[PDB]
Design a protein around this ligand. Structure first.
Ligand SMILES: C[C@]1(C(=O)O)OC[C@H]2O[C@@H](O)[C@@H](O)[C@@H](O)[C@@H]2O1
Length: 752
């Protein structure tokens, strides 16, 4: 035996769970039964005639890459059922032969060197199919003749002989070349797969274009926030290949591999909430029924479990703690229910180890400047904010997927609480795509997929604890402008809108919220202390509203309060909406089955052709109706300013003042004065200190931002980049933002 045999067996275990796969495990037995179950269904529906024109009638079409890819996926599942200890199909000779005969037929009539490598969909021909075929070849290695293996492997080499792409594509090429190299025992190709991870979009941090960024962001296809979509793929592929190679002659040695650990801590951890990977970073994948947020989150945790198997200290331990936490957290969908058998084996080892304690939940405010995203994580809830600009596109829609993703990244707010199923359970095909929470739009009117013309999109982070974001709105599809800001405190998220103007001749509205309700659609809700009707199919306008409370889908932890400073007129409706995933994902594999979900939708009618309209509301997670009414009697936030020039909010209890300055002119908001476009947040601790953080969201100021704070200081300390010129009678300093790429600069002033 040689080292290649060792690697092949190591990969085989990654696929089957290995020989130690304990069948006495509830979730394992449950997964192995599901596996054998699916295998029999396929094997039973196979056309085994020697004159067949397809393997499965439903997937016929030797030239349809979608179907061909699915055919190989089914064969992979069947191979798994025949090689997974515990499966009732383990070692079945007939099943194995039927699979290999299927591969031979597919080789002669569909997947071979006579087909173009670039025919649609290239991804299937060069990456999808080879990944499935490689796995089958490893699983049934001992039953595959030299003649057969040659047709399988020679074909893969034709479609993908080398690694030359970037990001996820490059990572996929690497795993295709790598696993095949193990099968055929080519040390040259294997070393190439290893080196492949050092390339663009993988190990090295991106500073533009595709890849992981130092600030935690992940971009793919040049202008799309994609941590949970293509990012998840780069993570999974990288983790698997690194694990396969670890300890071997081809173990990864590139020092930049340490960046992978940071992906987990900075790119993923802040974007996961009780098992769900936030949709705002999943791109067009939000339109995939088989990839709803928790399904995606499980895959990410599966990768973390994989990394925990070979990562160096103290990362392996940390990853185990993170995985343990998320597994315990997800009471919506069992983590073990949709991950590989080996992942289950490895995960159970972590969960069952009493010496491993679940990691602490993330608690912070993070600005993902490189992908126009922001997140707030707190006990009991998380808020994700999705924006776009001249640097990041509104949404991606290709290959007939996500055709209604219009406003999913246009000032959209996503609130995560104990209703873990909020964005799953067919939310995407039923929600009104024209009314994404937090957005301002021309009613029932779409926008195009693309970057905007405004550079002011971003925000400021105050010591990674609190923050503020903003987006200068300007759609290309129709006339509509506005300044939109969000201020994130402890349990209050203040949304402000100003300068809302349009000549489009279409009613303009701002969506306060749009929440999926319970099955009966009877969630209790109140306004100004009075109970509101809970019936479905009812539209009603609320005038002079100070506050609204909406009971959640869970007994506790999912209520949401809404406070309206100065009062507001709210348009609302409660309805059952029906749709199909096919409507937002027009692919043959997509189910056309109708699904119905209930919603409570609330928005503000700015009218047609508004001029300088505005809005202001406060999201209050986890407060009872009584508590929202109490809040309204003494609101903890105060709107300092809400003009087209500056939007500012103060949270007296925390001593916080946030301010977004929209123009390059000297303006003042409370104690803060700025001479240019900037996002600023200060925290004052009476007679103790005054903290200040500043950023240039435009990422285009080649000089500085001059700030003046109306307080007298005794001394200071600050990030390099900040130059303090005065401490008394008032504080004055400049922030060098040349090439800052939207980062925040912090200073601490001693008061006195
Ligand atoms: C299996 C599948 C899919 O349909 O989900 O095939 C198409 C692939 O397209 C890539 O661009 C990724 O989205 C990648 O995730 C996709 O995987």
């Amino acid at each position: 035996s040689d080292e290649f045999d060792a690697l092949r067996i190591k990969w085989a275990t990654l696929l089957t769970g290995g020989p130690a796969l304990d069948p006495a495990d509830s979730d394992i037995a449950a997964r192995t039964d599901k596996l054998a179950q699916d295998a029999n269904d396929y094997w039973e529906d196979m056309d085994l005639s020697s004159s067949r024109t397809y393997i499965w009638y439903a997937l016929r079409g030797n030239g349809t890459s979608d179907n061909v890819n699915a055919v190989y996926e089914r064969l992979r599942t069947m191979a798994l059922a025949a090689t997974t200890v515990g499966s009732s199909l383990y070692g079945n000779a007939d099943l194995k032969e039927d699979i290999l005969d299927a591969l031979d037929w597919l080789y002669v009539n569909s997947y071979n060197s006579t087909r173009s490598r670039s025919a649609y969909n290239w991804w299937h021909w060069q990456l999808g199919i080879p990944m499935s075929l490689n796995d089958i070849a490893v699983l049934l290695y001992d039953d595959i003749s030299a003649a057969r293996m040659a047709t399988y492997m020679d074909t893969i080499d034709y479609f993908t002989p080398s690694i030359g792409l970037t990001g996820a594509a490059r990572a996929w090429q690497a795993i295709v070349v790598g696993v095949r190299a193990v099968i055929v025992k080519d040390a040259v190709k294997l070393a190439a797969a290893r080196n492949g991870l050092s390339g663009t979009g993988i190990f090295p941090y991106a500073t533009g274009g595709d890849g992981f960024y130092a600030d935690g962001s992940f971009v793919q296809h040049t202008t799309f926030a994609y941590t949970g979509g293509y990012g998840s793929s780069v993570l999974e592929t990288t983790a698997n290949l690194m694990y396969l190679l670890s300890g071997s002659t081809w173990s990864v040695s590139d020092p930049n591999q340490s960046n992978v650990w940071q992906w987990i801590y900075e790119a993923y951890r802040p974007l996961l909430y009780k098992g769900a990977m936030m949709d705002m970073v999943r791109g067009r994948e939000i339109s995939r029924s088989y990839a709803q947020d928790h399904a995606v989150g499980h895959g990410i945790v599966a990768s973390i479990v994989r990394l925990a198997q070979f990562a160096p200290a103290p990362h392996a331990a940390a990853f185990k703690q993170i995985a343990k936490r998320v597994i315990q957290e997800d009471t919506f969908s069992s983590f073990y229910g949709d991950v590989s058998t080996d992942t289950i084996r490895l995960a159970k080892a972590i969960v069952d180890d009493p010496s491993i304690a679940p990691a602490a939940a993330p608690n912070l405010y993070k600005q993902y400047a490189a992908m126009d995203r922001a997140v707030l994580q707190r006990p009991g809830f998380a808020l994700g904010l999705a924006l776009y600009s001249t640097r990041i596109s509104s949404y991606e829609s290709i290959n007939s997927e996500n055709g209604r993703g219009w406003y999913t990244g246009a000032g959209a707010t996503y609130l995560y609480n104990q209703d873990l199923a909020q964005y799953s359970e067919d939310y995407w095909p039923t929600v009104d795509a024209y009314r994404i929470p937090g957005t301002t739009v021309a009613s029932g009117t779409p926008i195009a997929s693309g970057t905007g013309t405004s550079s002011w999109t971003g925000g400021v982070s105050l010591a990674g604890q609190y923050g503020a974001s903003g987006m200068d709105l300007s759609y290309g599809a129709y006339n509509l402008s506005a300044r939109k800001s969000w201020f994130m405190f402890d349990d209050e998220i203040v949304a402000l809108g100003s300068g809302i103007s349009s000549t489009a001749g279409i009613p303009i509205e701002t969506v306060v919220d749009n929440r999926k309700l319970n099955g009966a659609g009877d969630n209790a809700w109140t306004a100004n202390g009075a109970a509101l009707s809970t019936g479905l199919g009812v539209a009603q306008t609320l005038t002079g509203v100070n506050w609204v409370h909406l009971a959640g889908n869970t007994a506790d932890g999912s209520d949401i309060g809404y406070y309206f400073p100065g009062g507001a007129t709210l348009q609302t409706k409660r309805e059952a909406r029906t749709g199909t995933w096919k409507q937002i994902n027009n692919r043959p594999a997509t189910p056309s089955t109708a699904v119905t979900r209930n919603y409570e939708t609330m928005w503000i009618d700015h009218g047609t052709n508004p001029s300088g309209a505005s809005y202001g509301y406060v999201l209050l997670p986890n407060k009872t109706s009584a508590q929202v009414g109490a809040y309204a009697a003494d609101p903890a936030i105060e709107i300092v300013v809400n003009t087209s020039g500056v939007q500012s909010v103060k949270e007296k209890t925390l001593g916080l003042v946030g301010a977004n300055f929209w123009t390059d002119t000297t303006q003042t908001a409370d104690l803060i004065t700025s001479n240019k476009k900037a996002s600023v947040m200060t925290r004052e601790i009476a007679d103790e200190r005054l903290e200040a953080s500043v950023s240039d969201p435009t990422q285009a100021n080649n000089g500085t931002i001059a700030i003046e704070l109306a307080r007298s200081a005794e001394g200071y300390s600050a990030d390099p980049g900040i130059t303090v010129t005065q401490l008394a009678p008032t504080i004055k300093f400049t922030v060098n933002v040349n090439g800052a790429k939207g980062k925040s600069f912090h200073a601490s002033f001693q008061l006195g």
